Amino acid sequence: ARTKETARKSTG
Amino acid sequence: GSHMAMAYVIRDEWGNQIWICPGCNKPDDGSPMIGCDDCDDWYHWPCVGIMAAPPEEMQWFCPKCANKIKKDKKH
Ligand SMILES: *NCCc1c[nH]c2ccc(O)cc12
Ligand SMILES: [Zn+2]
Ligand SMILES: [Zn+2]
């Protein structure tokens, strides 16, 4: 399972 | 054609590869995507039933590949 969160524009 | 798209990865004005979830048919807007160990592509978490990042060490398959393993009667 590969996971990535590109939410670099969010504080969380 | 036998393919709705040539690849679920398009390009934006920035030239960057914008991923398209083969589930809801929507692009990545900077959210947490999960890559299947079979398809390898990036699917959205909510569409696949994921609410957080699970152990990468553990193998996981999308609702298509996880289904192709379990198998249905033929419906
Ligand atoms: N990436 C961790 C926090 C975050 C930001 N946006 C999200 C959408 C769905 C989800 O499960 C976590 C999350
Ligand atoms: Zn999706
Ligand atoms: Zn898959």
Q: Which of B42, B44, B51 to mutate to test the interface with A (most CBs of A within 10 A)?
A: B42
Residue A11: which region, alpha, beta or left (left: phi > 0; alpha: psi -120 to 50)? alpha
Distances (CA, A) of B22 to A12, B38, B59, B64: 26, 13, 19, 10
Which of B65, B56, B75, B69 has the alpha carbon at shortest distance from A5? B56
CATH of the domain at B24: 3.30.40.10
From the list B28, B31, B35, the residue facing A2 with the nearest CB is B35
- Domain membership of residue B68 as a residue range: 1-75
The whole-angstrom separation of Cα B20 and Cα B14 is 16
Experimental method reported for this structure: NMR
Query: Structural domain tally of chain B?
Result: 1
- How many alpha carbons fall within 13 Å on the CB side of residue B27? 10
